[PDB]
Design a protein around this ligand. Structure first.
Ligand code: PRO
Ligand code: PRO
Ligand code: PRO
Ligand code: PRO
Ligand code: PRO
Lengths: 356, 356, 356, 356, 356
């Protein structure tokens, strides 16, 4: 059925090795993405090339060879890059959204929940998210990587099924193709070991991204951007590059997410909502909450118990402690009236909750 | 001579109170800003209206009344808003750079230094920075404020001389103008008092922003965006609204910045660089550094001591501890060869240093 | 038993804060009102949203930001708003009548009596009156208030027992709920004081309306429109928001109405009608009138004296001086033949008369 | 060129003598009106039949034979009447606005200005105003007249060129057509004499309306509603009924309007605006006003002088005294900033001024 | 995840036993359906009550007691019924489509495919299909059943997961509830036995519909329309009436559909498309077709073999034999050029194929 694919396109794929973005290759890839999008799939694009767009837009000026010059070029050219993406996608009647994320945002619980919420909102409305790194405050991908770890983090955030990394090479080779005439492309890989890290070598960052994505239960595909119909075959299942299989299930990833750290808060729930959670496996509404203990923000993991005090679930909170205390015992429609804002009608969602 | 002005435009000023952005008012304001820019002044723009631009771009769809819907609209419309700013400013031959900042970024030392570096790079290249909140990860300004506190933070980050906030009203009135025919506009304010807070009230967020900016040594002017030539009059010195005077000097703000927290590390400096720092008050080059103690990141405040151990200065570090250790004792031209990147030829700048 | 409730719905409640009217919320409120109506209660609705309905009907055109544009939108959308109310109420088999009133109409005695007669005729025929401001001639509520004072005037005109105002917030808080976690909702209020005005602040117009209604002997409840079953709970007596108790009895309000101004005229009454007025306290028929002095219109307060000249009552006149002179001494069944119209068989009603 | 026609349709024309509104005749008349509207003319419709619509909608119930029953029927059926008008006009792609006016509103200066403003706004946007009497507060037209004087007042308010009254008779006859075989239809009338009032006689109210309209400089045409193409021929100039010629010019009417009463206020104007008013005959902007004397509301006649004190003009004021004092000496764009609302950029319009 | 529910509402549920449709009950049920629709489910409504709407619209005339009178009433009132459904659903911002189906249409292969195509198109675009019987040509449901078998056929056509029949009774009872105090509602039923038909008895048609639906692999729920939240509980899984479990899987139903009759035609397929069909299970494009044998229409079952003549699949054809012959061997984008119309890019869909 419907699937989620995260396509990562580097600077070499977008420019083709030249000093300018090659719009013909990008329009071919956009055509493939639109073909997939029309069939009901969800597409997330992690892009680079803001520095190239800024350099072209400014007339290729002479700047100091420092990080600040790259930050300036990225700041000037992020607008041009997103404008190009929107213009190319509007040919096929598709809208494009812009998200600027950093690793620190992914590490923060509240920021992670906010980013996941806006990404889900974009995906539910048939809008393609285009994701880059915020180069104003973070300079990690400028120095090394070129949005490689950002792609893995975006795949984890989007709940993707596949992560396709497009590069200039065809994939992973057992030996050097030039030196060894018998060197062959590796078809499937089950776990990254020291031998693969040694044979791989520019390909180290992609290997780290693949390891991170596969440890979270996402299948990674390293392929060549110039191969015709690469995105469509990746979605269908045809082998086009190197395939790294998921080393875990999504349930294991959710277990690690919930139980990685001790709960930040403690909430008590009446009998009816306890029965709804246990027997029916449904979400937790603010009506059933009786007491709120602890000082925690939105997105933190809290412990849900019954009136007797027995732990019954662990789940992430969609509201911080103060809002939960203020809206406890009320109906959903009143939440906005109580707070002036609304995150949704549930306090703890069922997909973010693990029953103990 | 040349000064720095930060102009804050809310959604009410941009849309004129209507459904969509009014480009005539924005083009008049851009004309005034370009007139100031051509005279050698530096202009920073803090703006809103990404949600309105996104709603107009998407055809005004029907969406749930949640925060995620506003995040989606902001993501879709940030590109359109920056496109509008770029197109309006290019009429006068001015380039525009986009920066997305949050309060957490300003609080963090490393992110603050990165953002200040990119803003300075933009300003020294005759590029107008356009600053908005990163709505994907932060929702503080969506709920309340409309980029009011962000304006003060950007004024502090840019080292601005004036912070002008454009609103619907003409300024601050002692009494209600409708009820009291004798009510008059307050011209000058020296400090924020409880009586001023009570009589202010929509203006509470502007009052907080003015207090924050004035405590940092920046004059804050609340004026009406519809006043003809308001920006030029503000920059020249003509009374146009309510003016809040700085309650501190920039030197006091630098002292509070440096000495607010204990130093994160310590670095020893040879006799030549000690004489340069003390007698001449110059920046600290990496060649003179002899040792590095502790683990600190870029942007943290460290203690500069001499060979005898007598503390001589306190200053923020342009490199983290590891890079400082690697490039200690080397010439500046080799920095990029040693690290793979360069932040500049100085380890601690003279304007970031306080001599003890 | 049967009671009169006046429900005031603002534009925020009707549209949900969005661009267009939200018919689901209005249908829920109409369901509650119909449930009350079927039980024998009388319901009066004061509404807004003519401008929003007109803007939606016209295709959201681009208009000058003047008062005349809002007047045009209200003129276009009043018909659509009344159509929506009629269609929603006819689901439950209830008819809807439209009344357009201004403050000047309420101030005038004759127009007040005409409007009260219309409202009473509507209420005795199981027809729900829907009251809005006549935006063609009056602009007071367009600028500020949103039919808040008009709600109090309609409650006074209808002889209502309760005036419920639906807003976005839950009611009145002693402290700011966001800033102070210990802030709590005020349940009951006995009189409007300066402390209440200071802590209230958007709610100032509601405070003025509550003061006006309570000075006339009507209990005013400020509640949230999104609260489930708020109308039924209000009518039963359950606390749902902030309650302001009546500071006068309806008898005191009638005394203030009758004796606020000097009588406009004097009429002499024979012995039989004098005995009916004094001993039995019945209405004054035109047959008993012997003379009419002065020139007054319908709805003015006049002095009823006996043949000996001793003043015996003060009451409002259902006919002007000329009609009273023409129909004096005649039977009530022939009023229409003499005048060409009939206001009823009584000259002064017993509930509009105070016996001296 | 373009003209303004006010069509008055009574209950007999709309119903055809039956108990229900005849939609075929109304659709024919609407077709003629739409033909005129498409050619660039401005059409204003003064209508009746709210009581008939209310009677039909309620199932023809049994009600007391009083004025309050007629007010109830009008309140219920005004919505139905305006809905019918809108539905019939939307066949030809024309929108319809609703205005409820009374004679007291026309007699009041501020209410007259508000009504004229909303009518002009409706006419400028290609919207047909449909005008009836507010039967909730006024009962004059219910008793006698059937919107006859209201039509003359609406023609005066709209600045119409022609007022066409449609009835069942063909016009005015010299003698009784049935008794006298030589009785002929009067083609033209120049002033109403006692002989005309005697020969006319149900036709007295139409004669009063024609006299009122022609005394204000508007040509009146009394014709039969069933005559094919009566509206088009009236606009073209073909004789179809009785024609009453204007007894005055519009300039005389404006002179009477300005100088009917002593000025309510006094304003002083600087030299530049004085020169603009005198030699150029332009409107008066708030920038040129120096002082404001007196307490007057919007729509009142005030005296405009120069700094020397010599009277230079008399004109109606678009703002009341307090607003004029608050916006005196400012620019137009700031008006909305100062007052919170705007009536337009001119304090006194050029078409409302008489130069002394 | 997302599910498909077919709700069947009889005349008794819509009218409540009276002579008119009860819009309050229908609006409650529509509110529940809209709540389900907003959550991503697909809702199909099989309705009755066209005769009641026609009787009400015509004023309840006197007609002969024949079938033709019922056909007349249904023809007049189908428009009114669909208008009522659309008006009630537009409160929640949902569109409604109208389909008139008969049993003969379901028995015909081409008509079945056309109806399934339009139903799928309506469901994919978030439009609620409202289904009734075409009473102009078919009179089966008029005589007996009241859209009971039509509901089962619509559930089979829509590929629904649940079929909920709403009636006035609470469900199926073991004995007569009034005669036997111990009579209890049957909770679950696994297959219809002669004992069930004997105990059931007006409930025979519902039993036949449940048997037909469950033999095709659809769970049936017989419940009471007046029970609050019956639709939501049915979707969730809460027991609210009598539950008839599916006696077969959807795969068995597809096997019966394909292999019920001998194939109507024969088509040969090249090697590439044969490989795509066999080991990948993909749809059959017109490019791979080599030869077409037989005379069959669209929707018939045909046999797909390879060039060697070995049978490889059986599937229903989306094009008739002539169109398939004309578009054989071409690309998909030129189907419209060749034929002048298009049914889609696949000759045989993958979900309609059984691989031999
Ligand atoms: O967009 C760019 O070009 C830089 C490099 C990767 C992250 N930001
Ligand atoms: O751009 C906007 O509209 C929102 C509000 C301020 C920050 N982001
Ligand atoms: O109906 C409206 O929208 C305006 C505001 C209140 C009075 N008229
Ligand atoms: O509309 C009607 O029928 C009444 C009579 C004229 C004025 N109002
Ligand atoms: O709609 C109706 O009322 C008839 C009876 C069921 C099928 N058609």
């Amino acid at each position: 059925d419907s699937q989620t694919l995260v396509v990562k396109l580097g600077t070499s794929v977008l420019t083709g090795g030249s000093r300018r973005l090659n719009r013909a290759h990008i329009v071919e890839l956009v055509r493939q993405c639109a073909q997939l999008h029309a069939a009901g799939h969800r597409i997330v694009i992690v892009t680079s090339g803001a520095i190239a767009a800024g350099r072209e837009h400014l007339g290729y000026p002479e700047l100091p060879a420092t990080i600040a010059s790259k930050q300036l070029l990225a700041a000037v050219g992020q607008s041009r890059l997103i404008q190009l993406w929107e213009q190319l996608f509007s040919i096929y009647g598709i809208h494009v959204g812009q998200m600027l994320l950093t690793r620190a945002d992914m590490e923060d619980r509240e920021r992670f929940l906010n980013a996941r919420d806006t990404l889900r909102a974009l995906l539910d409305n048939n809008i393609v998210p285009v994701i880059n790194e915020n180069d104003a405050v973070a300079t990690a991908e400028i120095k090394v990587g070129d949005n490689d770890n950002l792609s893995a983090l975006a795949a984890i955030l989007a709940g993707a099924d596949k992560l396709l990394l497009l590069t200039d090479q065809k994939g992973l080779y057992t030996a050097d193709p030039r030196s060894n005439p018998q060197a062959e492309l590796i078809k499937d890989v089950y776990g990254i070991d020291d031998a693969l890290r040694a044979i791989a070598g520019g390909m180290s960052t992609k290997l780290q991204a693949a390891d991170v994505a596969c440890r979270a239960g996402i299948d990674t595909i390293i392929a060549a951007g110039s191969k015709p119909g690469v995105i469509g075959d990746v979605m269908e299942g045809i082998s086009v590059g190197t395939l790294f299989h998921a080393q875990a299930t999504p349930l294991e990833n959710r277990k690690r997410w919930i139980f990685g750290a001790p709960p930040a808060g403690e909430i008590t729930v009446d009998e009816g909502a306890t029965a709804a959670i246990l027997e029916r496996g449904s979400s937790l509404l603010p009506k059933g909450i009786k007491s709120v203990t602890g000082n925690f923000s939105r997105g933190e993991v809290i412990r849900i118990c019954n009136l007797e005090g027995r732990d019954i679930a662990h789940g992430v909170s969609r509201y911080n402690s103060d809002a939960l205390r203020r809206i406890a015992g009320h109906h959903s429609q009143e939440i906005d009236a109580i707070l002036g804002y609304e995150y949704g009608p549930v306090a703890v969602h069922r997909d973010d909750m693990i029953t103990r």
